[PDB]
């Protein structure tokens, strides 16, 4: 997502050539030394074995010519806070003394209370009299990175789950609809107009031709310019990169305006996920231990759905025996499977390929090789000749179906500068509209990740008194012990922002909103709101707003002052005996989909030197039955299974084919033999001149 782009930049990495390795990493280099405040975010770091070695710059940080991370502060003089922003490095941060931005400035630069929170040189925190303060912070949320500043109600979340939230806010996938978050910070707009994935009107003008591919802007003084989109362009991780315009043919634009949304954007505000209705009951054990259930509405109406564009590539490299020709005809390939291939050998744009289809048909010279008597007989009887030239056509990998968005053919005849030996390199871009599925990983903005345990139908879903079904159902037990009640506040505010409130100020603005800005005394349904990070919605504000929502269509305040509602069980029918929390939470679709993870092997490729099965989903490979699992099955006493998994599934070269033959013929699985890692060893020891021999007696 665009944010992952803008955050892979601005990244500080201490594990580089000229730095330290992940083994020479002194454990004193990963802690947040108190000089990091305003120069490096203490929250956002990868949670793997890299914690603290990789971080990200602060929002306001700026790098000194010499390379020291400066930071803006406000100069307070004679107890007068000014607006002359002055930048300071860590040394002058230690010399001088720094106040806080959430301090009572009395509209004149003047502090109010003499005892002021302040930071001393060694990270100490002290109540200085308000005369020795010479610098004050430029704003709150100065300590924090870009991605973490987009988490509403961050100050309520624990640092662990906020860290997780920041590290998963960069893993959302671009959906096909891209809905803006109902509740957010100020950093959804400034994180898109500066991430580069949103076309920007360079100079003011009026649009003339707005089409799905090109916008023509008529810059006032004569000149015109055509901005061009990148519809359905493959990203570096297989995701879509569409750019659709948002302007009409008569609109006037100003310089610096958003003119076309990107992959994850809506009206210019970073939008990584959808605003889904959420209830917080534990339901039937399907949302057990972080699991999440969904309505079938999310699948059907295509609410959560990510387009994945995969690239396949085959080169027509030269060979000694001859030249590999990308041609339709292939030795044994029948016309039935051949149907897709057009003439050159490539598929036609649009053919729905499935695991095993011939995307590109390439035939490689093989020369004359002996034909087994039996094969010769069959070939003659059925009237099929040899055509020695062997088949090595590209085939769509297992579980990579979809349409063929586009085919790109590079050839030496066209003077394309392919690497030496490659007469032709063709790349086929297949693509699929993956929908939400059991095992897909969904997460909010607060670290509350979880797989989809079950997509229930729409009727067996707890619906409100209005008949509106809830869309997801999180679990309760995950909230209190993870210390991330942000999601709860985000939930309540979310509902407030959906139904819209009307501050009952008929008798004057209640104290609950005495400090709330103007034009918040009333709000409209589906009205967008924002809470900055460390100056957000004081809990009292949420209580009062939650108790001051306007009814939907009838006279019906569905969510009472406590924030809960009377849900009806969609399955049984009886109302739940206790009111339940409901609201609108903004949740994302992470890039840990099942289709990228499910894997299986019965018999596939084999390694070269040792004869073990290969490794990884790119090949088939098996799962490493490692040392600890060997201990586990030694502890059970399972000897025969251990012998199996270490002889006639991995290495017993003559034993594997016998096992397969005996399975097909329906016979007892053969007795296993010596592996091929106790014979390479034997020949090595008889090669280092150590006579290792086996004598039964």
């Amino acid at each position: 997502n665009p944010l992952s782009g803008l955050t892979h930049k601005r990244r500080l990495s201490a594990l580089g050539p000229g730095g330290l390795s992940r083994e020479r990493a002194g454990l004193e280099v990963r802690d947040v030394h108190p000089s990091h405040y305003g120069r490096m975010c203490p929250i956002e770091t990868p949670e793997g074995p890299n914690i603290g070695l990789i971080g990200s710059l602060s929002v306001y940080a700026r790098v000194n010519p010499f390379g020291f991370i400066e930071t803006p502060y406000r100069k307070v003089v004679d107890g007068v806070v000014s607006d002359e922003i002055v930048y300071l490095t860590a040394d002058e941060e230690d010399r001088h003394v720094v106040a806080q931005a959430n301090s009572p400035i009395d509209a004149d630069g003047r502090f109010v209370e003499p005892r002021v929170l302040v930071r001393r040189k060694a990270g100490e925190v002290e109540y200085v009299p308000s005369s020795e303060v010479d610098y004050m912070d430029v704003s709150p949320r100065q300590m924090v990175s870009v991605a973490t500043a987009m988490i509403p109600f961050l100050e309520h979340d624990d640092a662990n789950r906020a860290l997780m939230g920041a590290n998963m806010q960069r893993q959302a996938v671009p959906l096909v609809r891209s809905e803006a978050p109902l509740v957010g910070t100020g950093m959804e707009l400034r994180a898109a107009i500066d991430a580069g994935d949103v076309v920007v009107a360079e100079e003011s003008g009026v649009i003339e031709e707005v089409s799905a591919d090109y916008i023509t802007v008529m810059h006032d003084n004569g000149t015109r310019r055509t901005y061009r989109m990148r519809k359905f362009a493959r990203s570096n991780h297989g995701t879509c990169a569409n750019q659709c315009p948002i302007v009409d043919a008569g609109d006037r634009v100003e310089a610096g305006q958003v003119i076309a949304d990107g992959p994850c954007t809506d009206d210019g505000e970073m939008a990584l996920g959808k605003n889904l209705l959420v209830a917080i009951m534990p339901w039937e054990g399907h949302n057990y231990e972080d699991a999440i259930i969904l309505s079938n509405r999310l699948v059907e109406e295509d609410v959560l759905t990510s387009i994945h564009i995969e690239e396949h590539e085959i080169d027509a490299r030269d060979t000694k025996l001859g030249a590999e020709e990308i041609t339709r005809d292939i030795p044994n390939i029948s016309d039935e499977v051949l149907a897709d291939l057009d003439e050159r050998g490539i598929v036609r744009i649009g053919a729905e390929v499935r695991d095993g289809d011939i995307l590109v048909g390439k035939v490689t010279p093989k020369g004359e090789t002996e034909l087994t008597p039996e094969e010769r007989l069959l070939r003659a009887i059925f009237g099929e000749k040899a055509r020695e030239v062997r088949d090595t056509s590209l085939k769509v990998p297992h579980g990579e179906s979809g349409k063929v968005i586009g085919i790109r053919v590079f050839s030496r005849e066209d003077e394309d500068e392919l690497p030496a030996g490659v007469n032709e390199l063709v790349r086929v871009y297949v693509a699929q509209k993956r929908k939400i599925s059991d095992g897909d990983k969904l997460a909010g903005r607060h670290g509350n990740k979880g797989v989809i345990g079950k997509i229930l139908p729409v009727e067996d879903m707890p619906f409100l008194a209005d008949g509106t079904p809830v869309d997801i159902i999180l679990n309760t037990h995950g909230v209190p012990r993870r210390m991330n009640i942000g999601q709860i506040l985000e939930t309540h505010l979310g509902w407030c922002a959906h139904s819209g409130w009307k501050v009952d100020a008929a008798k004057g603005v209640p104290d609950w909103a005495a400090r709330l800005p103007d034009e918040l005394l009333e709000a409209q349904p589906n009205a967008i709101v924002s809470t900055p990070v460390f100056d957000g919605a004081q809990e009292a504000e949420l209580q009062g707003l939650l108790s001051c929502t306007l009814p939907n269509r009838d006279g019906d305040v569905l969510v009472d002052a406590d924030g809960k509602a009377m849900l009806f069980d969609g399955r049984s029918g009886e109302p739940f005996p206790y009111p339940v929390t409901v609201g609108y939470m903004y949740i994302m679709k992470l890039h840990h989909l099942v289709d990228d993870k499910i894997h299986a092997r019965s018999t596939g490729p084999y390694s070269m030197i040792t004869q073990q099965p290969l490794g990884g989903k790119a090949q088939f490979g098996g799962q490493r039955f490692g040392e600890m699992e060997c201990w586990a099955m030694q502890a059970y006493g399972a000897a025969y299974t251990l012998q199996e998994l270490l002889t006639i599934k991995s290495d017993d070269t003559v034993g594997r084919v016998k096992v397969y033959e005996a399975i097909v013929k329906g016979e007892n699985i053969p007795e296993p033999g010596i592996p091929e890692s106790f014979k390479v060893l034997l020949k090595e020891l008889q090669s280092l001149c150590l006579n290792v021999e086996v004598l039964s007696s």
Binding site: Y60, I85, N102, S139, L189, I193, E254, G268, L520, D535
Partner: peptide, 22 residues
């Protein structure tokens, strides 16, 4: 705010941040 076509997103900021995001 300060971006021509800005989604009118009402903020709860009690404070007033002087410096713009760089």
């Amino acid at each position: 705010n300060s971006v021509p076509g800005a989604p009118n997103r009402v903020s709860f900021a009690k404070l007033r941040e002087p410096l713009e995001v760089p």
